[PDB]
Structure formats: C-alpha cells, structure tokens
Design a protein around this nucleic acid. Structure first.
Lengths: 97, 165, 124, 173, 210, 167
RNA sequence: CGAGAAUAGAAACUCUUGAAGAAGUAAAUUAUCUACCCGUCUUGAAACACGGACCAAGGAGUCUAACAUGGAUGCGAAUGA
RNA sequence: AUAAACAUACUUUGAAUCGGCCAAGUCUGGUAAGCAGGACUGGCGAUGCGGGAUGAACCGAACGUCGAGAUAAAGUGCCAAA
RNA sequence: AAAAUGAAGACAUUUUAACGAGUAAGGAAACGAAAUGGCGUAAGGACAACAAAAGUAGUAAAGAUUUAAAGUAAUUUAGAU
C-alpha cells in the first residue's frame, strides 16, 4: 500500500539501505582502530606502573602512534585543537554572565 | 425595580460632557448628509425637542431619506428572537457622521489609483502593476540576524523582596 | 453449505416485575413509569430490547438446519417450493389430518424436500 | 529539573532594540523555562510576548558532574504572613541537583508548594562557609560514621519473595 | 488506454523529488545561517512556526457558548480529534480562548507524514473517504495542483498558497488515547498539566496517540 | 459523543409520485431514468415537478399559454399540471405538453390547429428538451393564503375566517 | 548499487475429538461480580408520602353537527344536485 | 482569518410548558440559615456509566449489540484491579 | 444522505460515508427506491389444490397444560397430552 500511495518509496529505501550498510561498517572500522589505541595505551600503562611506579619522573611519550598521517594533517590537528579550545572558552564566558 | 419612564436611568447617559455644555458646533448643522451615508445616533440632551429614544444612543445607522430639517436613519433593533428595521427622523443635532468606513474608503482609493495606472500602462504596452495585497492578521515574523557589535546585555533574575512600608 | 448463525442474545426479554406478581405476565412491555428502575437503565437492571440486538440479515429467520420454514396444507402446496428445496423446508400445519399427512410426507420424498413434521400424528 | 539559557529582545516604541535580556532558568523542560522568562520580563520590564522576540533557549549542562560542591541558594517564598528571603545550603554535584533538593526540602519543612518560591540566585561556597547545623558536620576531611540497623539489600525485584524461610536479621553492614 | 498510469507515476516522482528539494534546501539555509552567525559572534533569531496541530482534550459536556462556537470553527467537535491550524494573530487568540479544552503545539515533518498516511481522510461528496490512492487525491485536489499524497504532505507542512483549500478537504483526524499529563488535565502544561501550548513537545504526545 | 449542530433527519424533498396512480408512477420511472442517464437539467426539473403535491402544481389556463408562447411560435410549452380553458379569450395555434387537459381546453387547443401532448410523447420526441418552454402556474392565487397570519397586524393583516356575527 | 520499463520464476497443507452424543441451547443447583417498591403528584420518593392481600372476567378520547389546515381522488369557470 | 450544500431561507398546522431546583474566584435584605430574591453560564429536572464508602446537582464523560487495545477522573498494605 | 441498478428477484435492492442517551410531546393509512416499520382481538366483502370436485376438519376443529423453534420486541410456529 505504501508503494501504491508513494512510488518514491523504492528510491528512498534502496538508497537508505546503502546508507545503513556502510554506516554499520564505519562502526567496525573505528573499533579496530580504537582497539589499537586501546592496546597501545595498555602497553604504556602496565609498563609504567610496573617499573617506575621519588622515581615519579616517568617517560613522557610511552604512548605510541598507530595511524600514520602526513605532515600537513599534523598541522591541522593542532589547528583544530586551538579552535575547539576557543569555542569552549567562547561558550563558557557566555553562560557565565 | 425601575419605572417605565421614557427617559429612565439617564442621570449619567444624558449629562453633557465635562466643560462641553452650551451650544454645539456649527459643523453639526453645516455637515451635508446624503442618502446612503453612515451616521451615528448621539442624543443631545440640550435639545429636548425631537430627542431620540435612549436605546438608539450610539447605534450606527444608514441615511435613507433627507427631509428639509430632519435626517432619516435606518437602524437595526433586536426583539425577542429576531431583528427588526427601525426608521427614524432625527434632526442633525442628535446625529454625527460615522467613520465606520474610514479605512475601507482608503483601500478603495488605492485600488482605483492602481487601476487608473494599469489602463495607461496597457495602452503603452508595458506590464501592469499588481493590486495591493490584502490585509492579514499578524503573521509569524521571519528569521532575522542581529549584529552583535552594537548589542548590550542585561541579566534578568528574580528580585529580592523589599517591604513597601 | 450452511453459514454460522450468530445470535447476540440467546435469553428472553422478560417483563419487569413479572417474577414477583402473577398478574403481570412475561410478555415484554416497555416500562413507562416516571421512577422505573429499568427504563432509567440502572446498574443490574438495564436489559431492554433494542434494534441493535437483531441478528444478521443473511441468517435471519433461518432454522438451525439451515433452511427457511414454509407451511404447507396439501400436496399441491409442496409444488411451490420444489424448485428451492435447498433453501426452504416444508412444514405441515397443525390442523392437517393424519391421512393428508401421509400424502404430504410421501410426496415430499418424491420431490426431495425436507419436512420438519415427519414424525407427527404417527399411529400407535 | 533542567537549567536553560534564554535570551530575547524587545521591538517596540518604549524599549530600544539593542538591549538583549539574558537569564538562567531552572525548569522541568524548555516550555516551562520560557514561561518563567516571559513573566520575569513582563513583571520587571513591561515586555510582553506579542511585542518581543525570543532568540536562544539552549540547555546548560554541568561541566564536571563528578565534583562534590557546597551550593548556596538565595530564594524568596510566600507564606501565610508575607514574603521572606531565605538562604539554604546543599551538598551535591550538579546545579540542577541541588535545586531539586531545595524544592523538596522547602515543600516539606515550610509546606510551601513550588508555585510560591522564586530562586534569585544559586552560587558555590567554600567548606567552612556552610552554616547548616546538620550539613556542617560533613564538610570536614575526617567524617566517619557506621551505618547501623541496615536492612538487608535485595539485588532486584526478582528475589522479593513475600514469605521468607527461617529467622530475620538486620545488618551492621 | 491505461498507458497514462505510467505517465502519472513518473509525474508523481517528479513532484516528490521537487517537494523534498524545497524542504531540504530550507533546512540547509537555516543550519547555515545559525553556523555563520556563530562564527561572526552575531545573534540569530529563529522564525516562528507557521503550522500548528491542536487536539481536543475534553468532552462535549459543560462548554460555554463562546467556547462551543470556536471549537466548531476549528473542527474540534470530538474528544481526541486533531486538526492543522494556521498561525497568525486571529487563530492564536482563538486557541488561547479555548485553552482549557485543547492542547496544541508545532508538529515536525515526520509527525505530519504519519498523521496523513495513517489517519488521513478526505471529504468526497460529503463522505469521509480514507486515503487509499493518488487517483482520489488527484480527483479531489487536482484543481489545486495537488495530485499526490506527497504534494498533500508538503503543502500542509510549509503552508503553501492553497493551504486553506487543502486543509479544509482533510477530515479531522481521529486519534487514540495516551497519557495526557503528569498531574492531570485540569491545569496548564506549564504547571505540569494537560492543556495549553506544548510547543515542540506535542510530538511526544502525538507519537503515543497516532 | 460528537458535538453536531443538528442530527440527521429526513430531507424534506419528495422523490416519487405521491399516491397510487399507476401512470404517474411510470412517468416518474421514465424521467428518473432519463435524468439519471442523459444528465439533462430539463429531465431533472420535470422529475422534481412530477413529485410535488397537488396543491403545489397549480393550473395554467390557455390564456397564459397564449401570452407566453407569443414570441415562441414553433415551440412546445411544457407545464407539469392541468391546463384549463379561459373562455374569455381566444386560443391560438400552439403545442402543449401537460399532465391533463380539460375537456374544453383540449377542444380549444385542437380546434385552433394546435396539438395536445402527454409527457411520454414529449420524452419520445424531445427527451432532453430543445424546443420547449417551461411554465408553471401561480401559487399565491389560492384563497387559503388570504387568512394566514394575524388579522390584527398593522402591516399585512389576515382575512378573518367568517363565523358568528362577522361584520 | 541501482528506480521505470522489457524479458523469465516459483502456493495448495497436517493432527485430534464427535450417534459410545461434537458445537450450541435450555432447566435445576452451586460459586465471583451485580440488583432498594411498582403507579402517581412533585425541584426532589426506596421513602416514616398516598393506592396496592391474591386470581379471573369487565374497564376509560367515543358519536352527531359547524369551520380550518393538510396528504390521496374526480371535474374545472365551474363543481355538487 | 476560520467554519458552512443532508448549507441556507423558510411557510403552514399543531402538542406539551411557563410550581422549578443546584453550583459559583457573583450581588441585595438578614446575626444567620439546607433562608428570601436577582445578573451571566453550566447542569439536575429529562440522566444512565467510571470515581468521591453511601448522595438529583461534585470530578471525568453522556449510552444501538459485542471483541480487542490505548485512556479520563482517581488510585496501587488487605477488603480491592494496580 | 449521495451515487448505481430497477417489472418483480427479495431480505423493504447494491455500495460508500456519517450518526443511534432522553420525561412531557410529535411522527394516521397509501405513496419502488416508498413523507417511520410492524404484532395482536373481533366482524363484513373477496382470495386459498387452476386439468370439470379447488384452504383445514371424527385418520380428531376450537379451547386448555407443557416442550422446542423463529423474531431485538410486540408475537408467531410445531410436537406431546
């Protein structure tokens, strides 16, 4: 009955499916990543409580990179972080009256 | 329990306006009424002769006949479950021109000016102007942007109670 | 074939106070009193005949066997339903003698018509 | 209870349209929050809905809802006698959390329904600035007490049998 | 012969494509304006809603004659009946007068679609015929350039030029029951009650009533 | 319930031939069929006027037919009522279709060279109605209408049913 | 990947009970819920308001005459006789 | 602006009725009254159903015969569904 | 209520839609798409086995007592005595 009333249902259902299928895969291909960054910060923890933990000076860079990006994108990460810091300061000042 | 006098309960209805006693303006007897005009009946207690009944006070009627000294007025009167037509003959002292059509006659003139320009434009071949838009109730105002360079903020909060004594 | 005959109320609409007084019979009469417990439709006593109780138009006046009753007084009156033996059923009148009943009962067997009084006034 | 940040402007002859009113309203939803804002504008600035425009009604969320803070609330309520100004102190982790405590407490101790209380302002004070006779005993570092007469806890309604077996006992926890 | 069925189906798709373009394009402009106004540090004032849905909350017993007439003018003649109303100075005042007997608010697009698809109907020859095909919608509203159900939804949501003719053809929706209020329907929704202006929160109520 | 202004009551329009006249029943059958199929407003009009009561179908005399047919020489006057004869004035040549013709009216119309038709012939000849003129008689000429109202009224008094000592 | 369209494809079943009484219906009893005395005057009666012990038969808008409206009928400047 | 074709305008003939009663973000006489009398609206009378234990008027809501669900007033220790 | 069909079927046609509380009171008969639909008492004029012996009845009428069936109901129908 929906097709009889709205023939556009077939166009926005197949195309809706392809949105769903890929969007589900993005969850998977963000969990594999967040498995590395979660299994690269374990071997920066059980390697830091273990020996060093006074001898509180522990190495600053026990966390290791897992996804590689070009130098230009590295500059954009610090550009983005500056913007979101400004946005947080922009909002906090506003609601603080 | 009131009485059935012709002018009962007129201590405040028939009183003259404050500092408005004495004679009336001469525009009252100089204004020209034509059949079809809209008038408002306003009893003038200073002229006891031909005083219209107090139930017609402030009623807006139409002029249906013009006699040498009196103006005929046609007003609606409510009866048990129906409306009847009342035809009076009132001297010009007890009536007043009505502005009930003040704005309607202004929008009549606006459409007449446009129509007059349209016939000239059609002769010239150029496109005609559109008629004025109809009046509408207050519409939902559209989205607007506010420039913050000249914007001042004042906080609003509940006020501490202060005694009036 | 036979449709499912559905009755919305299988009881009887008895008269008000018919159970208490023997002069008030059980035939229904709508109470017209000004303080009547029934016509005011109180709780408990709110059972009145209404048009909504009527049975389906398809199966109205249909006997449980699935056929419509048709009274016959003689063998000739059977010939009026011999074309509709799948719709009507014969019914010998209560005043038809036993001799005329045998002719009606025999003839209906010839014409294949169902008779509902086939066991009436049978001899000893 | 939710906190909202509301702004509006007045476009008419009396008020110039370059003055923006702000407020932080505590309300169960944004519809109630707007109503408290419009009445505040009308009773203090003669600004009415039919002659003003609303701009923002965004919510305000607690920045760190994991830090225990001593909140101080300045409010005014109406009793049988007259109108009074009160100042109460509560220990909670969210601004909307303490206001929920304030409304319940006021309706209990003073028998004052919500529609008689106006919250002027809510702030945060230090540890030693709490003067509540009961709450002053928990602001310290070394608070300690045994919870006695514990009723045994049920994991869920699944095991809530009406009749039990054997004797019953409380817990010293 | 029946080759017009193929042409009609294609035409409906073109109308549907065009309508979804207008709704999506207007959504982007509002989002872009809000985004840009934040970058500039400016203030953006949203536009007032143009469409309003109202539900009759109370029964037919104990209504003053003034309220009785207004509810008849809005076609809210039965409890749990919903209609679409234009927003202006006249209608908003009419809804304020009958506030205790109605709850109303601003519908979302998905709310409009579900009401029209599930509870939609038309008054054809004085008969309340439920919507079953585009042929009957074309027959009733073809003169008003509304030839499919998605034209009908778009016109209601955006309040087009022919809203009055389209809205008047739509029979008042008959809704189910749902939890009316927190305390009761004898107080305003602002007080936690049932009647009054719920604004966009009316969509939660309509979700349980459709 | 539902707040309806008023409940459903029978619409006060007659849709069949009043009485047990077998021929008038067939005429309504004929024109109810003609109006339904041809969808002509003429057959709809004739069918509606065939179903009025006798008092609402007043007579039309030959004088009225003559005056109304003056500038319609080759036409067929159609009046759904009895056609009486006006002996004061002559009858010209014309064709009339009517429910019933008075014995003298039929002779006068015929003797002048005209024709007296029935409604069945008219449908056979002019079903949708092409050379016809629709005519109905006067309703206010009834004497009963004189006594309706209040005879004490200042504007349009009634006419005082006569009785005991009426002066 | 894919809407339209053109071209080809596919659905006829199992078990149990019943003239040793199935489904339904009816009567009696039991059990849960439910139920104040009918008629009448009255703003209001189950009323501490009146009539009613029970049953059968009888029992109350009719007939003549004048007028009016109205629906069916005949004739129609006539109709009735 | 909104609503309105089983809309609108009625015409004719006629029934019953003009003992009323209640509520109140109302008023007058009275110390006061389940007192007497009024303005506006809604009800009871003419009205059953769910709730207030019970009740002419209170709250919800007005009724063809049934099945399934979401509800309203209002409630969830037992009588009593939660 | 509106469409469709319509000399005879039949269940007072077919379809769609809206509706259905009620004291006093009204809705006489007839009217094919019927201007509400029906039950019962008694008497008068007809009709009742169509092929020249034409409704039932001593092969058991009316009535009475009950058992069942049809109808929302007024009531009707049939069995047994």
């Amino acid at each position: 009955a929906m097709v009889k009333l709205n023939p556009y249902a077939k166009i926005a259902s197949h195309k809706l499916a392809q949105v769903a299928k890929a969007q589900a895969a993005h969850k998977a291909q963000y969990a594999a990543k967040m498995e590395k960054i979660l299994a690269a910060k374990k071997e920066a923890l059980n390697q830091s409580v273990a020996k060093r933990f006074i001898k509180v000076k522990v190495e600053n860079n026990l966390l290791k990179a897992t996804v590689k990006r070009t130098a230009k994108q590295d500059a954009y990460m610090k550009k983005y972080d500056g913007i979101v810091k400004a946005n947080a300061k922009k909002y906090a000042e506003k609601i603080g009256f | 329990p009131l009485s059935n006098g012709r002018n009962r309960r007129t201590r405040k209805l028939f009183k003259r306006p404050f500092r408005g006693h004495g004679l009336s303006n001469t525009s009252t007897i100089l204004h020209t009424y034509k059949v079809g005009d809209y008038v408002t009946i306003l009893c003038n207690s200073s002229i006891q002769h031909g005083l219209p009944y107090k139930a017609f006070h402030g009623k807006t009627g139409r002029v249906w006949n013009v006699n040498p000294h009196a103006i005929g007025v046609m007003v609606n009167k409510k009866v048990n479950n129906r409306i009847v037509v009342k035809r009076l003959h009132i001297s010009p002292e007890h009536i007043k021109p009505s502005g009930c059509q003040k704005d309607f006659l202004e929008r009549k003139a606006a459409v007449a000016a446009i129509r007059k320009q349209n016939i000239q434009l059609k002769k010239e071949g150029k496109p005609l102007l559109p008629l004025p838009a109809k009046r509408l109730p207050k519409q939902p105002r559209p989205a607007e942007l506010i420039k913050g360079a000249d914007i001042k903020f004042t906080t609003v909060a509940p006020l501490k109670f202060e005694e009036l004594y | 074939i036979k449709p499912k005959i559905v009755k919305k109320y299988t009881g009887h609409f008895k008269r008000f106070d018919s159970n208490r007084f023997l002069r008030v019979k059980a035939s229904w009469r709508v109470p017209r009193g000004i303080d009547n417990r029934l016509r005011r439709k109180f709780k408990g006593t709110n059972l009145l005949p209404k048009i909504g109780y009527g049975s389906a138009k398809a199966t109205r006046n249909m006997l449980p066997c699935g056929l419509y009753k048709f009274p016959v007084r003689n063998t000739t009156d059977l010939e009026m339903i011999m074309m509709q033996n799948r719709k009507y059923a014969a019914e010998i009148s209560h005043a038809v003698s036993a001799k005329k009943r045998q002719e009606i009962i025999q003839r209906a067997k010839i014409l294949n018509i169902r008779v509902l009084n086939a066991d009436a006034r049978i001899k000893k | 209870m939710k906190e909202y940040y509301i702004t509006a402007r007045c476009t008419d002859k009396a008020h110039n349209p370059n003055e923006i009113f702000r407020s932080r309203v505590f309300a169960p939803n944004y519809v109630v929050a707007k109503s408290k804002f419009w009445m505040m504008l009308k009773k203090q600035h003669k600004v009415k809905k039919i002659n003003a425009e609303l701009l923002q009604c965004q919510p305000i969320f607690e920045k760190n809802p994991t830090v225990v803070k001593n909140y101080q609330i300045f409010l005014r309520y109406v009793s049988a006698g007259g109108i009074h100004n009160i100042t109460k102190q509560y220990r909670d982790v969210t601004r909307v959390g303490a206001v929920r405590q304030m409304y319940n407490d006021l309706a209990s101790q003073y028998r004052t329904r919500q529609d008689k209380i106006q919250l002027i302002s809510i702030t945060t004070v230090g540890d030693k600035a709490v003067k509540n006779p009961v709450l002053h005993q928990f602001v310290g570092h070394h608070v300690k007490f045994p919870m006695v007469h514990c009723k045994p806890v049920i994991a869920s309604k699944r095991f809530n049998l009406p009749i039990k077996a054997g004797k019953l006992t409380t817990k010293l926890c | 012969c029946k080759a017009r069925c193929q042409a009609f189906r294609k035409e409906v798709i073109l109308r549907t494509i065009k309508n979804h373009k207008d709704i999506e394009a207007a959504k982007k402009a509002v989002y872009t304006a809000k985004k840009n106004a934040e970058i500039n540090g400016d203030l953006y004032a949203e536009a007032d809603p143009k469409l309003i849905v109202a539900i009759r909350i109370r029964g037919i017993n104990g209504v003053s004659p003034k309220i009785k007439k207004i509810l008849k003018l809005l076609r809210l003649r039965q409890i749990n009946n919903a209609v679409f109303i234009k927003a202006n100075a006249s209608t908003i005042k009419m809804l304020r007068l009958v506030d205790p007997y109605v709850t109303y608010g601003y519908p979302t697009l998905e709310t409009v679609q579900k009401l029209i698809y599930k509870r939609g109907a038309l008054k054809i020859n004085g008969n309340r015929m439920p919507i079953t095909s585009n042929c009957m919608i074309k027959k009733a509203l073809g003169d008003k350039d509304v030839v499919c159900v998605d034209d009908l939804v778009h016109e209601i949501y955006t309040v087009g030029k022919h809203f009055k003719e389209v809205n008047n053809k739509l029979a008042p929706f008959k809704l189910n029951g749902a939890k009316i209020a927190e305390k009761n329907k004898k107080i305003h929704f602002i007080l936690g009650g049932g009647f009054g202006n719920r604004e966009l929160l009316i969509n939660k109520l309509l979700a349980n009533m459709i | 319930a539902i707040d309806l202004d008023r409940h459903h009551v029978r619409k006060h329009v007659s849709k069949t031939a009043r009485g047990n006249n077998a021929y008038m029943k067939l005429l309504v059958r004929l024109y109810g069929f003609l109006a339904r199929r041809t969808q002509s407003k003429f057959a709809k009009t004739i069918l509606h006027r065939l179903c009025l009561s006798r008092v609402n179908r007043p007579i039309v005399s030959t004088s009225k037919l003559a005056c109304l047919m003056k500038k319609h020489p080759e036409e067929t006057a159609v009046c759904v009522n009895t056609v009486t004869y006006d002996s004061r004035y002559p009858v010209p040549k014309m064709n009339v279709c009517a429910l019933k013709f008075t014995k003298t009216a039929e002779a006068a119309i015929t003797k002048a060279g005209g024709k007296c038709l029935r409604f069945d012939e008219l449908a056979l000849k002019a079903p949708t109605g092409r050379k016809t003129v629709l005519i109905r008689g006067k309703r206010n000429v009834r004497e009963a209408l004189k006594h309706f109202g209040k005879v004490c009224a200042k504007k349009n008094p009634a006419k005082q049913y006569k009785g005991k000592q009426t002066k």
